[PDB]
Amino acid sequence: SLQEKLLSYYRNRAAIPAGEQARAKQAAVDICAELRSFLRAKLPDMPLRDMYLSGSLYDDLQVVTADAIQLIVPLVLEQNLWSCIPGEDTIMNVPGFFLVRRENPEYFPRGSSYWDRCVVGGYLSPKTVADTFEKVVAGSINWPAIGSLLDYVIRPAEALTLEVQYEKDKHLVIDFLPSVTLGDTVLVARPHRLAQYDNLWRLSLRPAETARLRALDQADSGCRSLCLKILKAICKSTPALGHLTASQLTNVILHLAQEEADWSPDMLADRFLQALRGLISYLEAGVLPSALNPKVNLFAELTPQEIDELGYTLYCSLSEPEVLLQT
Amino acid sequence: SLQEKLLSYYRNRAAIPAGEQARAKQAAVDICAELRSFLRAKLPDMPLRDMYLSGSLYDDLQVVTADAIQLIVPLVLEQNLWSCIPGEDTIMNVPGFFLVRRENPEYFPRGSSYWDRCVVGGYLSPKTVADTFEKVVAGSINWPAIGSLLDYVIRPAPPPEALTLEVQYEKDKHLVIDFLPSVTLGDTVLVARPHRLAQYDNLWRLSLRPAETARLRALDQADSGCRSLCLKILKAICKSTPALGHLTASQLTNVILHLAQEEADWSPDMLADRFLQALRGLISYLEAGVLPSALNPKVNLFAELTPQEIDELGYTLYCSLSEPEVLLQT
Numbered sequence: 001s002l003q004e005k006l007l008s009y010y011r012n013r014a015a016i017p018a019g020e021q022a023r024a025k026q027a028a029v030d031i032c033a034e035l036r037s038f039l040r041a042k043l044p045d046m047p048l049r050d051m052y053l054s055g056s057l058y059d060d061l062q063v064v065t066a067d068a069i070q071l072i073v074p075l076v077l078e079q080n081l082w083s084c085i086p087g088e089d090t091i092m093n094v095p096g097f098f099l100v101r102r103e104n105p106e107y108f109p110r111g112s113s114y115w116d117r118c119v120v121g122g123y124l125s126p127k128t129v130a131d132t133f134e135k136v137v138a139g140s141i142n143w144p145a146i147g148s149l150l151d152y153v154i155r156p157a158e159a160l161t162l163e164v165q166y167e168k169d170k171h172l173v174i175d176f177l178p179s180v181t182l183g184d185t186v187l188v189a190r191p192h193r194l195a196q197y198d199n200l201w202r203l204s205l206r207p208a209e210t211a212r213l214r215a216l217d218q219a220d221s222g223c224r225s226l227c228l229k230i231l232k233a234i235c236k237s238t239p240a241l242g243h244l245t246a247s248q249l250t251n252v253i254l255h256l257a258q259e260e261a262d263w264s265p266d267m268l269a270d271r272f273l274q275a276l277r278g279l280i281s282y283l284e285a286g287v288l289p290s291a292l293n294p295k296v297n298l299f300a301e302l303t304p305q306e307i308d309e310l311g312y313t314l315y316c317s318l319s320e321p322e323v324l325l326q327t
Numbered sequence: 328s329l330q331e332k333l334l335s336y337y338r339n340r341a342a343i344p345a346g347e348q349a350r351a352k353q354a355a356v357d358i359c360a361e362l363r364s365f366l367r368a369k370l371p372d373m374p375l376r377d378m379y380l381s382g383s384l385y386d387d388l389q390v391v392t393a394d395a396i397q398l399i400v401p402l403v404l405e406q407n408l409w410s411c412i413p414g415e416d417t418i419m420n421v422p423g424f425f426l427v428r429r430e431n432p433e434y435f436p437r438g439s440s441y442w443d444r445c446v447v448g449g450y451l452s453p454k455t456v457a458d459t460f461e462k463v464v465a466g467s468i469n470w471p472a473i474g475s476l477l478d479y480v481i482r483p484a485p486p487p488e489a490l491t492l493e494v495q496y497e498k499d500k501h502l503v504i505d506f507l508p509s510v511t512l513g514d515t516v517l518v519a520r521p522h523r524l525a526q527y528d529n530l531w532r533l534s535l536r537p538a539e540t541a542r543l544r545a546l547d548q549a550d551s552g553c554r555s556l557c558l559k560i561l562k563a564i565c566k567s568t569p570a571l572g573h574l575t576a577s578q579l580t581n582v583i584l585h586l587a588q589e590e591a592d593w594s595p596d597m598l599a600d601r602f603l604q605a606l607r608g609l610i611s612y613l614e615a616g617v618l619p620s621a622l623n624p625k626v627n628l629f630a631e632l633t634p635q636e637i638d639e640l641g642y643t644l645y646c647s648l649s650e651p652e653v654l655l656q657t
Contacts, residue, residue, distance in 0.1 A: 036377060044511035045406035050377040052367055076403065079372040080438060112439040114405050181371035
């Protein structure tokens with residue numbers, strides 16, 4: 001039965017071994033601690049809060065292997081010197097992306113904020129911030145030595161990413177993610193795929209999506225997360241489905257969760273099939289709205305050939321969904 | 328025999344029982360972790376880094392009972408807008424302290440920096456920074472909620488203040504956590520720990536304890552020496568003797584550091600001799616009225632004591648030479 005194949009596939013393929021998960025998290029934590037001592041000693045005058053770990057691995061949503069985690073690099077912006085402008089209120093009209101504008105330049109001249117050194121054309125550039133960060137922070141750390149202290153080999157790559165070998169044949173990729181918060185709005189420097197939109201900060205969706213997902217299950221107590229992890233593992237293991245993202249898949253689950261309230265254990269097979277059908281529907285329309293930010297098309301960064309290959313692969317699977325479940 | 332009396336005194340009076348030490352420190356660690364998680368998502372415009380633990384209890388040098396630890400609150404002062412002026416170069420004329428000045432107040436007007444709200448007369452007031460921290464940071468924290476979460480009873484001190492936390496980590500064991508706002512300019516680390524006298528209340532304190540403690544531990548680590556043991560015994564005597572209460576962990580640490588500069592042999596059998604030298608040394612510093620910081624010789628660690636308090640301590644120590652049973656009770 002499909003139900004059995006899904007249950008066993010989660011344990012056999014999607015679930016990360018406990019030892020591997022613990023060692024990957026410990027390595028992330030040790031490295032996070034090292035940046036903290038580094039910032040304290042070397043950058044006392046840069047308005048940046050401490051870096052901290054974030055992501056699927058931490059949220060127990062990572063699958064197959066523990067291979068990635070984010071280190072958020074939280075810039076401090078003066079609330080009276082900066083504002084954010086929603087991409088849909090601009091002429092570029094890019095929902096889910098924001099400009100960060102330098103305010104009051106007549107009264108507060110350049111130098112009134114540390115981050116003025118990353119302003120281009122009156123906007124805090126996410127590209128220059130990212131560059132600034134690597135040159136001032138990332139390139140200033142003796143990774144080989146720190147790697148020697150712990151028993152990891154650490155290798156800077158994708159220049160804002162670290163490869164950390166925490167086991168034989170197991171590596172964790174840590175990416176540094178510059179971030180700003182203005183009022184209630186959290187923005188990250190994760191560039192749009194299109195370089196013409198490269199002064200645009202990305203609205204941070206993942207923490208709220210993960211929160212809502214955890215909330216939905218914690219009261220059920222349902223198999224949404226279980227279904228999501230199976231989907232993530234499938235896409236990660238199937239080269240033609242690799243373009244789908246953890247966030248896209250979470251949103252497919254979130255939209256399905258608004259149309260179906262029963263996620264009891266035995267419903268996993270049906271929901272799984274519904275998730276496949278929802279994905280096809282979104283792919284054909286070329287539109288997958290963010291469940292929490294309806295203006296935002298999460299498929300807006302996929303290319304025609306990608307949407308086509310994705311659509312085709314799922315179609316070919318409809319009659320025999322179990323073929324996606326290779327383990 | 329002095330050797331035996333000292334080892335006995337350490338075991339029976341100075342040493343904190345392992346369970347008490349472990350639970351007290353773990354409580355401070357738990358609280359620190361929870362504040363870190365809670366505060367990271369708050370106060371997005373405040374240049375505030377993660378709070379971190381500091382002090383004797385954290386460095387395994389606290390004696391008699393686990394009763395206190397510091398939470399350092401590291402604040403970021405921007406490049407270019409701030410400078411520090413050594414206290415000896417101010418009219419205050421006091422080493423070991425600094426004024427922090429807001430640079431270029433006109434070209435980069437008031438309001439350019441988060442900390443401009445804490446500036447008084449063009450200087451960053453450590454008292455005003457402490458105030459902002461209490462109102463804005465501490466005041467955003469739900470203490471009953473954190474305590475309920477970790478199964479601790481955490482009670483904030485009422486104003487005034489300063490805001491310290493009374494932590495019952497198990498019925499009935501207590502620890503006090505004090506918050507220490509801190510800024511760093513270049514390689515000068517300053518803390519908001521006010522001079523004893525109000526006319527000097529505009530001055531930040533030069534942080535000395537971490538480097539002192541690191542040197543002591545490095546020395547003992549290299550030769551398995553008894554410098555820390557001798558320090559802990561001295562600390563317990565001073566803590567257990569009311570007339571000696573004005574002596575601080577730091578003052579005593581520097582007595583041991585100065586002695587370590589004069590004596591290389593701190594093998595276990597030398598404890599008694601080193602203890603006597605430390606004691607005679609302490610008396611000599613009191614007599615000169617000056618105990619220089621081993622790491623910053625310009626700084627007189629007795630500068631906040633009155634001449635009368637200094638005389639009284641010297642006198643007390645002299646009288647104790649003939650009363651060893653009182654000095655070593657219990």
